[PDB]
PDB file of N, CA and C in Angstrom:
ATOM      1  N   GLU Q   1      22.943 102.167 -51.448  1.00  0.00           N
ATOM      2  CA  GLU Q   1      24.332 101.684 -51.191  1.00  0.00           C
ATOM      3  C   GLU Q   1      24.323 100.154 -51.168  1.00  0.00           C
ATOM      4  N   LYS Q   2      23.637  99.569 -50.222  1.00  0.00           N
ATOM      5  CA  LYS Q   2      23.592  98.081 -50.156  1.00  0.00           C
ATOM      6  C   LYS Q   2      22.523  97.585 -51.128  1.00  0.00           C
ATOM      7  N   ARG Q   3      22.665  96.376 -51.592  1.00  0.00           N
ATOM      8  CA  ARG Q   3      21.702  95.835 -52.594  1.00  0.00           C
ATOM      9  C   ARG Q   3      20.490  95.189 -51.931  1.00  0.00           C
ATOM     10  N   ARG Q   4      19.388  95.208 -52.633  1.00  0.00           N
ATOM     11  CA  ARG Q   4      18.147  94.578 -52.125  1.00  0.00           C
ATOM     12  C   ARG Q   4      17.400  93.975 -53.313  1.00  0.00           C
ATOM     13  N   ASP Q   5      16.528  93.042 -53.074  1.00  0.00           N
ATOM     14  CA  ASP Q   5      15.780  92.420 -54.200  1.00  0.00           C
ATOM     15  C   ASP Q   5      14.579  93.292 -54.565  1.00  0.00           C
ATOM     16  N   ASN Q   6      13.711  92.804 -55.406  1.00  0.00           N
ATOM     17  CA  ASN Q   6      12.522  93.610 -55.804  1.00  0.00           C
ATOM     18  C   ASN Q   6      11.617  93.817 -54.585  1.00  0.00           C
ATOM     19  N   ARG Q   7      12.016  93.322 -53.439  1.00  0.00           N
ATOM     20  CA  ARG Q   7      11.163  93.444 -52.218  1.00  0.00           C
ATOM     21  C   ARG Q   7      11.759  94.430 -51.221  1.00  0.00           C
ATOM     22  N   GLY Q   8      13.057  94.462 -51.104  1.00  0.00           N
ATOM     23  CA  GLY Q   8      13.712  95.381 -50.122  1.00  0.00           C
ATOM     24  C   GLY Q   8      14.523  94.539 -49.134  1.00  0.00           C
ATOM     25  N   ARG Q   9      14.661  93.263 -49.401  1.00  0.00           N
ATOM     26  CA  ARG Q   9      15.439  92.387 -48.477  1.00  0.00           C
ATOM     27  C   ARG Q   9      16.920  92.530 -48.787  1.00  0.00           C
ATOM     28  N   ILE Q  10      17.735  92.641 -47.785  1.00  0.00           N
ATOM     29  CA  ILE Q  10      19.194  92.784 -48.027  1.00  0.00           C
ATOM     30  C   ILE Q  10      19.819  91.402 -48.243  1.00  0.00           C
ATOM     31  N   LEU Q  11      20.071  91.034 -49.472  1.00  0.00           N
ATOM     32  CA  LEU Q  11      20.689  89.695 -49.741  1.00  0.00           C
ATOM     33  C   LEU Q  11      22.213  89.815 -49.632  1.00  0.00           C
ATOM     34  N   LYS Q  12      22.867  88.738 -49.282  1.00  0.00           N
ATOM     35  CA  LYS Q  12      24.346  88.774 -49.080  1.00  0.00           C
ATOM     36  C   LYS Q  12      25.129  88.437 -50.355  1.00  0.00           C
ATOM     37  N   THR Q  13      26.429  88.418 -50.223  1.00  0.00           N
ATOM     38  CA  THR Q  13      27.339  88.119 -51.369  1.00  0.00           C
ATOM     39  C   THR Q  13      26.909  86.838 -52.100  1.00  0.00           C
ATOM     40  N   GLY Q  14      27.116  86.790 -53.392  1.00  0.00           N
ATOM     41  CA  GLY Q  14      26.763  85.568 -54.175  1.00  0.00           C
ATOM     42  C   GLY Q  14      25.261  85.517 -54.466  1.00  0.00           C
ATOM     43  N   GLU Q  15      24.434  85.762 -53.489  1.00  0.00           N
ATOM     44  CA  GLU Q  15      22.966  85.714 -53.740  1.00  0.00           C
ATOM     45  C   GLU Q  15      22.605  86.725 -54.833  1.00  0.00           C
ATOM     46  N   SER Q  16      21.600  86.432 -55.615  1.00  0.00           N
ATOM     47  CA  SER Q  16      21.199  87.370 -56.703  1.00  0.00           C
ATOM     48  C   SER Q  16      19.730  87.122 -57.066  1.00  0.00           C
ATOM     49  N   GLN Q  17      19.048  88.122 -57.572  1.00  0.00           N
ATOM     50  CA  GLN Q  17      17.602  87.955 -57.934  1.00  0.00           C
ATOM     51  C   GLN Q  17      17.414  87.957 -59.455  1.00  0.00           C
ATOM     52  N   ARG Q  18      16.533  87.117 -59.943  1.00  0.00           N
ATOM     53  CA  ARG Q  18      16.257  87.056 -61.413  1.00  0.00           C
ATOM     54  C   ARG Q  18      15.035  87.918 -61.746  1.00  0.00           C
ATOM     55  N   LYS Q  19      14.736  88.108 -63.009  1.00  0.00           N
ATOM     56  CA  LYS Q  19      13.546  88.940 -63.357  1.00  0.00           C
ATOM     57  C   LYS Q  19      12.283  88.166 -62.975  1.00  0.00           C
ATOM     58  N   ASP Q  20      12.386  86.870 -62.873  1.00  0.00           N
ATOM     59  CA  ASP Q  20      11.187  86.060 -62.538  1.00  0.00           C
ATOM     60  C   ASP Q  20      10.951  86.125 -61.033  1.00  0.00           C
ATOM     61  N   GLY Q  21      11.941  86.541 -60.283  1.00  0.00           N
ATOM     62  CA  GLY Q  21      11.775  86.668 -58.802  1.00  0.00           C
ATOM     63  C   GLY Q  21      12.515  85.546 -58.075  1.00  0.00           C
ATOM     64  N   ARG Q  22      12.665  84.398 -58.679  1.00  0.00           N
ATOM     65  CA  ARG Q  22      13.378  83.305 -57.963  1.00  0.00           C
ATOM     66  C   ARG Q  22      14.791  83.758 -57.623  1.00  0.00           C
ATOM     67  N   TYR Q  23      15.244  83.427 -56.450  1.00  0.00           N
ATOM     68  CA  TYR Q  23      16.605  83.835 -56.028  1.00  0.00           C
ATOM     69  C   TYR Q  23      17.640  82.870 -56.616  1.00  0.00           C
ATOM     70  N   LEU Q  24      18.898  83.188 -56.466  1.00  0.00           N
ATOM     71  CA  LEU Q  24      19.979  82.325 -57.020  1.00  0.00           C
ATOM     72  C   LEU Q  24      21.250  82.519 -56.183  1.00  0.00           C
ATOM     73  N   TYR Q  25      21.901  81.441 -55.826  1.00  0.00           N
ATOM     74  CA  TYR Q  25      23.175  81.531 -55.050  1.00  0.00           C
ATOM     75  C   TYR Q  25      24.187  80.583 -55.691  1.00  0.00           C
ATOM     76  N   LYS Q  26      25.444  80.721 -55.365  1.00  0.00           N
ATOM     77  CA  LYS Q  26      26.487  79.835 -55.970  1.00  0.00           C
ATOM     78  C   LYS Q  26      27.396  79.295 -54.866  1.00  0.00           C
ATOM     79  N   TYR Q  27      27.759  78.040 -54.946  1.00  0.00           N
ATOM     80  CA  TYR Q  27      28.662  77.450 -53.907  1.00  0.00           C
ATOM     81  C   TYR Q  27      29.605  76.438 -54.571  1.00  0.00           C
ATOM     82  N   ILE Q  28      30.626  76.004 -53.872  1.00  0.00           N
ATOM     83  CA  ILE Q  28      31.587  75.019 -54.466  1.00  0.00           C
ATOM     84  C   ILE Q  28      31.293  73.616 -53.935  1.00  0.00           C
ATOM     85  N   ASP Q  29      31.367  72.625 -54.788  1.00  0.00           N
ATOM     86  CA  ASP Q  29      31.093  71.227 -54.348  1.00  0.00           C
ATOM     87  C   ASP Q  29      32.382  70.577 -53.827  1.00  0.00           C
ATOM     88  N   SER Q  30      32.316  69.322 -53.471  1.00  0.00           N
ATOM     89  CA  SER Q  30      33.525  68.607 -52.958  1.00  0.00           C
ATOM     90  C   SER Q  30      34.510  68.355 -54.086  1.00  0.00           C
ATOM     91  N   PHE Q  31      34.127  68.636 -55.294  1.00  0.00           N
ATOM     92  CA  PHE Q  31      35.039  68.385 -56.442  1.00  0.00           C
ATOM     93  C   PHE Q  31      35.694  69.703 -56.866  1.00  0.00           C
ATOM     94  N   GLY Q  32      35.273  70.802 -56.289  1.00  0.00           N
ATOM     95  CA  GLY Q  32      35.896  72.117 -56.628  1.00  0.00           C
ATOM     96  C   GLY Q  32      35.197  72.742 -57.831  1.00  0.00           C
ATOM     97  N   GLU Q  33      34.210  72.086 -58.368  1.00  0.00           N
ATOM     98  CA  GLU Q  33      33.502  72.649 -59.549  1.00  0.00           C
ATOM     99  C   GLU Q  33      32.413  73.631 -59.074  1.00  0.00           C
ATOM    100  N   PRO Q  34      32.118  74.657 -59.844  1.00  0.00           N
ATOM    101  CA  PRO Q  34      31.082  75.674 -59.474  1.00  0.00           C
ATOM    102  C   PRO Q  34      29.646  75.169 -59.682  1.00  0.00           C
ATOM    103  N   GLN Q  35      28.780  75.397 -58.718  1.00  0.00           N
ATOM    104  CA  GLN Q  35      27.347  74.967 -58.852  1.00  0.00           C
ATOM    105  C   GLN Q  35      26.449  76.169 -58.587  1.00  0.00           C
ATOM    106  N   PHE Q  36      25.182  76.016 -58.844  1.00  0.00           N
ATOM    107  CA  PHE Q  36      24.221  77.120 -58.598  1.00  0.00           C
ATOM    108  C   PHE Q  36      22.926  76.529 -58.052  1.00  0.00           C
ATOM    109  N   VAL Q  37      22.278  77.222 -57.156  1.00  0.00           N
ATOM    110  CA  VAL Q  37      20.999  76.717 -56.574  1.00  0.00           C
ATOM    111  C   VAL Q  37      19.893  77.731 -56.870  1.00  0.00           C
ATOM    112  N   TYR Q  38      18.673  77.270 -56.945  1.00  0.00           N
ATOM    113  CA  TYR Q  38      17.522  78.177 -57.241  1.00  0.00           C
ATOM    114  C   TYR Q  38      16.449  78.004 -56.172  1.00  0.00           C
ATOM    115  N   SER Q  39      15.674  79.022 -55.927  1.00  0.00           N
ATOM    116  CA  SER Q  39      14.602  78.893 -54.904  1.00  0.00           C
ATOM    117  C   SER Q  39      13.697  80.123 -54.938  1.00  0.00           C
ATOM    118  N   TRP Q  40      12.428  79.933 -54.705  1.00  0.00           N
ATOM    119  CA  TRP Q  40      11.482  81.080 -54.703  1.00  0.00           C
ATOM    120  C   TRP Q  40      11.428  81.659 -53.289  1.00  0.00           C
ATOM    121  N   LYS Q  41      12.409  81.348 -52.479  1.00  0.00           N
ATOM    122  CA  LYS Q  41      12.430  81.861 -51.076  1.00  0.00           C
ATOM    123  C   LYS Q  41      13.853  82.240 -50.666  1.00  0.00           C
ATOM    124  N   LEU Q  42      13.995  83.270 -49.866  1.00  0.00           N
ATOM    125  CA  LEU Q  42      15.351  83.680 -49.387  1.00  0.00           C
ATOM    126  C   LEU Q  42      15.558  83.101 -47.982  1.00  0.00           C
ATOM    127  N   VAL Q  43      14.557  83.193 -47.138  1.00  0.00           N
ATOM    128  CA  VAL Q  43      14.656  82.632 -45.746  1.00  0.00           C
ATOM    129  C   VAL Q  43      13.566  81.564 -45.594  1.00  0.00           C
ATOM    130  N   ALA Q  44      13.657  80.764 -44.569  1.00  0.00           N
ATOM    131  CA  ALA Q  44      12.649  79.684 -44.362  1.00  0.00           C
ATOM    132  C   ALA Q  44      11.294  80.275 -43.955  1.00  0.00           C
ATOM    133  N   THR Q  45      11.245  81.535 -43.608  1.00  0.00           N
ATOM    134  CA  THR Q  45       9.945  82.143 -43.183  1.00  0.00           C
ATOM    135  C   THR Q  45       9.217  82.746 -44.388  1.00  0.00           C
ATOM    136  N   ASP Q  46       9.836  82.774 -45.533  1.00  0.00           N
ATOM    137  CA  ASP Q  46       9.156  83.365 -46.721  1.00  0.00           C
ATOM    138  C   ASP Q  46       7.971  82.487 -47.127  1.00  0.00           C
ATOM    139  N   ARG Q  47       7.364  82.802 -48.237  1.00  0.00           N
ATOM    140  CA  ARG Q  47       6.194  82.014 -48.717  1.00  0.00           C
ATOM    141  C   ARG Q  47       6.178  82.063 -50.251  1.00  0.00           C
ATOM    142  N   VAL Q  48       6.119  80.936 -50.906  1.00  0.00           N
ATOM    143  CA  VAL Q  48       6.111  80.960 -52.390  1.00  0.00           C
ATOM    144  C   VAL Q  48       4.708  81.344 -52.890  1.00  0.00           C
ATOM    145  N   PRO Q  49       4.608  82.053 -53.991  1.00  0.00           N
ATOM    146  CA  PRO Q  49       3.283  82.438 -54.547  1.00  0.00           C
ATOM    147  C   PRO Q  49       2.498  81.202 -54.994  1.00  0.00           C
ATOM    148  N   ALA Q  50       1.197  81.236 -54.885  1.00  0.00           N
ATOM    149  CA  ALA Q  50       0.379  80.062 -55.308  1.00  0.00           C
ATOM    150  C   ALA Q  50       0.887  79.549 -56.659  1.00  0.00           C
ATOM    151  N   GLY Q  51       0.710  78.286 -56.934  1.00  0.00           N
ATOM    152  CA  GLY Q  51       1.202  77.725 -58.227  1.00  0.00           C
ATOM    153  C   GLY Q  51       2.603  77.148 -58.015  1.00  0.00           C
ATOM    154  N   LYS Q  52       3.410  77.798 -57.216  1.00  0.00           N
ATOM    155  CA  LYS Q  52       4.781  77.292 -56.949  1.00  0.00           C
ATOM    156  C   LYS Q  52       4.732  76.424 -55.683  1.00  0.00           C
ATOM    157  N   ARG Q  53       5.458  75.338 -55.640  1.00  0.00           N
ATOM    158  CA  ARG Q  53       5.414  74.467 -54.423  1.00  0.00           C
ATOM    159  C   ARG Q  53       6.379  74.986 -53.361  1.00  0.00           C
ATOM    160  N   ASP Q  54       6.352  74.368 -52.214  1.00  0.00           N
ATOM    161  CA  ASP Q  54       7.293  74.753 -51.140  1.00  0.00           C
ATOM    162  C   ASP Q  54       8.708  74.505 -51.654  1.00  0.00           C
ATOM    163  N   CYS Q  55       9.680  75.054 -51.003  1.00  0.00           N
ATOM    164  CA  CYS Q  55      11.081  74.840 -51.440  1.00  0.00           C
ATOM    165  C   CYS Q  55      11.984  75.158 -50.258  1.00  0.00           C
ATOM    166  N   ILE Q  56      13.183  74.667 -50.252  1.00  0.00           N
ATOM    167  CA  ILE Q  56      14.074  74.965 -49.103  1.00  0.00           C
ATOM    168  C   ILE Q  56      14.766  76.307 -49.331  1.00  0.00           C
ATOM    169  N   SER Q  57      14.629  77.219 -48.408  1.00  0.00           N
ATOM    170  CA  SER Q  57      15.276  78.547 -48.582  1.00  0.00           C
ATOM    171  C   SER Q  57      16.764  78.336 -48.847  1.00  0.00           C
ATOM    172  N   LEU Q  58      17.400  79.289 -49.459  1.00  0.00           N
ATOM    173  CA  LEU Q  58      18.850  79.149 -49.761  1.00  0.00           C
ATOM    174  C   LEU Q  58      19.649  78.993 -48.468  1.00  0.00           C
ATOM    175  N   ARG Q  59      19.497  79.926 -47.573  1.00  0.00           N
ATOM    176  CA  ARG Q  59      20.254  79.892 -46.280  1.00  0.00           C
ATOM    177  C   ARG Q  59      20.282  78.464 -45.733  1.00  0.00           C
ATOM    178  N   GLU Q  60      19.149  77.827 -45.678  1.00  0.00           N
ATOM    179  CA  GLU Q  60      19.101  76.435 -45.158  1.00  0.00           C
ATOM    180  C   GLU Q  60      19.780  75.494 -46.156  1.00  0.00           C
ATOM    181  N   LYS Q  61      19.644  75.760 -47.425  1.00  0.00           N
ATOM    182  CA  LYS Q  61      20.288  74.882 -48.441  1.00  0.00           C
ATOM    183  C   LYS Q  61      21.815  75.053 -48.368  1.00  0.00           C
ATOM    184  N   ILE Q  62      22.283  76.269 -48.411  1.00  0.00           N
ATOM    185  CA  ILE Q  62      23.753  76.514 -48.352  1.00  0.00           C
ATOM    186  C   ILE Q  62      24.363  75.707 -47.198  1.00  0.00           C
ATOM    187  N   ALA Q  63      23.831  75.840 -46.020  1.00  0.00           N
ATOM    188  CA  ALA Q  63      24.397  75.096 -44.860  1.00  0.00           C
ATOM    189  C   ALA Q  63      24.363  73.587 -45.139  1.00  0.00           C
ATOM    190  N   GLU Q  64      23.343  73.113 -45.800  1.00  0.00           N
ATOM    191  CA  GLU Q  64      23.243  71.648 -46.077  1.00  0.00           C
ATOM    192  C   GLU Q  64      24.168  71.232 -47.237  1.00  0.00           C
ATOM    193  N   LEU Q  65      24.240  72.004 -48.290  1.00  0.00           N
ATOM    194  CA  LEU Q  65      25.101  71.596 -49.444  1.00  0.00           C
ATOM    195  C   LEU Q  65      26.588  71.657 -49.082  1.00  0.00           C
ATOM    196  N   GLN Q  66      27.035  72.698 -48.448  1.00  0.00           N
ATOM    197  CA  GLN Q  66      28.481  72.761 -48.089  1.00  0.00           C
ATOM    198  C   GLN Q  66      28.770  71.690 -47.039  1.00  0.00           C
ATOM    199  N   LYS Q  67      27.862  71.527 -46.127  1.00  0.00           N
ATOM    200  CA  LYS Q  67      28.048  70.547 -45.025  1.00  0.00           C
ATOM    201  C   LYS Q  67      27.748  69.105 -45.465  1.00  0.00           C
ATOM    202  N   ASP Q  68      26.875  68.894 -46.425  1.00  0.00           N
ATOM    203  CA  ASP Q  68      26.548  67.486 -46.831  1.00  0.00           C
ATOM    204  C   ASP Q  68      27.397  67.070 -48.026  1.00  0.00           C
ATOM    205  N   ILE Q  69      27.785  67.999 -48.846  1.00  0.00           N
ATOM    206  CA  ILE Q  69      28.622  67.633 -50.016  1.00  0.00           C
ATOM    207  C   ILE Q  69      30.038  67.398 -49.524  1.00  0.00           C
ATOM    208  N   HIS Q  70      30.425  68.102 -48.491  1.00  0.00           N
ATOM    209  CA  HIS Q  70      31.811  67.969 -47.961  1.00  0.00           C
ATOM    210  C   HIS Q  70      31.860  67.077 -46.720  1.00  0.00           C
ATOM    211  N   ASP Q  71      32.227  65.841 -46.893  1.00  0.00           N
ATOM    212  CA  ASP Q  71      32.350  64.940 -45.719  1.00  0.00           C
ATOM    213  C   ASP Q  71      31.051  64.985 -44.900  1.00  0.00           C
TER     214      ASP Q  71
END
């Protein structure tokens, strides 16, 4: 019924998983134009596979992009 990634994590609206595994979310900027963010992590407690560097989880990014792009 509810959606999950190739792992079993329940991702929320907008969030989506690619065949490569990197997650993807979409948000609106201060100009009203559509943007997209990428990350090999869903939460800040995840861990990227060797070869990939650290990255900011989406949840933490979403709060920063909506809050930092807007005033």
